[PDB]
Amino acid sequence: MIQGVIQKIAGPAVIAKGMLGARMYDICKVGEEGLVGEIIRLDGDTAFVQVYEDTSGLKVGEPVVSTGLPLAVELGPGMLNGIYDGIQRPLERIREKTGIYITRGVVVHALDREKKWAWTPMVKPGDEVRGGMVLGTVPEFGFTHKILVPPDVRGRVKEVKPAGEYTVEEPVVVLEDGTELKMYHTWPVRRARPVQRKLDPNTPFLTGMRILDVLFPVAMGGTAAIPGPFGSGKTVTQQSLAKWSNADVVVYVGCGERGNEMTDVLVEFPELTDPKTGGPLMHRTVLIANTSNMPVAAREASIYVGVTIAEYFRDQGFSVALMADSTSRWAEALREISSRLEEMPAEEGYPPYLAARLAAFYERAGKVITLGGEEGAVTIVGAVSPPGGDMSEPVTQSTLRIVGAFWRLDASLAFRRHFPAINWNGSYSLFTSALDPWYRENVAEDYPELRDAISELLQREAGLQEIVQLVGPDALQDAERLVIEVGRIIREDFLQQNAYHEVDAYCSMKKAYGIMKMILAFYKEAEAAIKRGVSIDEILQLPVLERIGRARYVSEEEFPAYFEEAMKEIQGAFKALA
């Protein structure tokens, strides 16, 4: 291999001379310790290497060895129920080897080479195999893991291992040209995995939140962005999505965030229940952790590793949801790397190619037809952290041009403890018109009409709030007072949701439909009562208002009995007066 020596050290940047023949974006071993590095610039006899670990203590003259391969991850059984480093290293072995502190130079295999896996063959000798075909099955925590041909391999089957227990590195299928296929394969993280076709998303991604499932839906295979200042509620929303969504596999990427938030997932999740399989919740979740005090250059690799794992699980027919904690930290890492290269900066010091990377990252999502023939989808939700809440910053503006949903948070609502604090006036969703055929047969035929009525009521309340604060509430007529009060009722009882309450944390679609029906029925009855001369104070002091407010705390099993009685209660209460 190509071997050289260090001739310049400056921060996370190492320049190695004598590296003629090295290729762009390859993986190198830097120094006598063996730090992992990547080549990003070639200049004559020297090469420019960025280092994914701490460079303190290195001396000029240490050897540099190039592996001749780009950055790749090991894809196979054993990735579920695991916590990984930014360059795909299991942290539970790092703790065993080094203790409570993370130290550089530790080399650990990504997949366990000692665990035995039950093997059930599917192919036979003499068969013809192509990329993405299934040649066997391996059991997992309720899932059936499929061993897939690598996408760039073609040939004919020569022999098949019989049924039994083997490790991941034992060959199971040998091709007629001499190629030996194991239970795992390696794939470069910077290359998108091939697919046959892409399909239009037409099924909803149920998040469990009322305001996101009703007002601003996101389809299976779409993309969404959630910006907001600190303390707005991005992490709580992402963790609630991880807990309560209907996706088969959830991949969580923590890029440059707190370590306590990652420890919370490691502690709480093994004791929870999977919404659809009935097992432990951690059995379907993969964690990639790179905290803020960890080396900066590993932030870029973690996003690619997570999206590559999500693409790999997509090819098996599963439905994968990918959550990124913050892309602003990735932008900061790119800015630091470009500053070490002394390149010309764009606005706010970011490199000019920042938008291309974000476009190439969000493009990997979508519902596809796999090479094997199954159907899978990947949905990406990425949180953005503008500095002062200024959403004119380049990262937010580059993100808004490719995403299909925009969940804008407000610092004004977060200070008054109104959650999830979604600014319903600035938010939008482009997937609403495509999910209406699904809603019309899976929930109710009149669901879009009720949603439009609720939106119109919110718009009218927002319009009247200017007159309310510029003339005073006393100058308003009773008809406008009714609209103001109904808007307040809607805001307090439907949009607001508690993520820590034992019942209110999850809400089905039919429960939200029933709440909307109750609110609209109350509004219609109160509107009818106004023409009959009933005072607005008599309407507001009715005890049926508390029944609507307490409706969101009712469990799913008891809710239909609550709704059936509450409708008659509303009708009788408005019948008994005047």
């Binding site: 010309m344 900066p345 010091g349 510029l470």
Partner: protein, 51 residues
């Protein structure tokens, strides 16, 4: 009522916008000063140090 509204609403709203615009212009001036430094460094190198 009009005096109270003008005193407590409009004036801080204008003042914050003024401060924001001043900060943006200051940042732009610093960013162009950095580019001028870089191009002066480039000019000083190729005209004296090269053979």
């Amino acid at each position: 009522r009009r005096v109270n509204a003008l005193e407590q609403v409009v004036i801080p709203g204008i003042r914050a916008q003024i401060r924001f615009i001043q900060q943006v212009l200051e940042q732009r001036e610093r960013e162009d000063t950095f580019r001028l430094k870089r191009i002066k460094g480039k000019i000083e190198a190729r005209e004296a140090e090269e053979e």
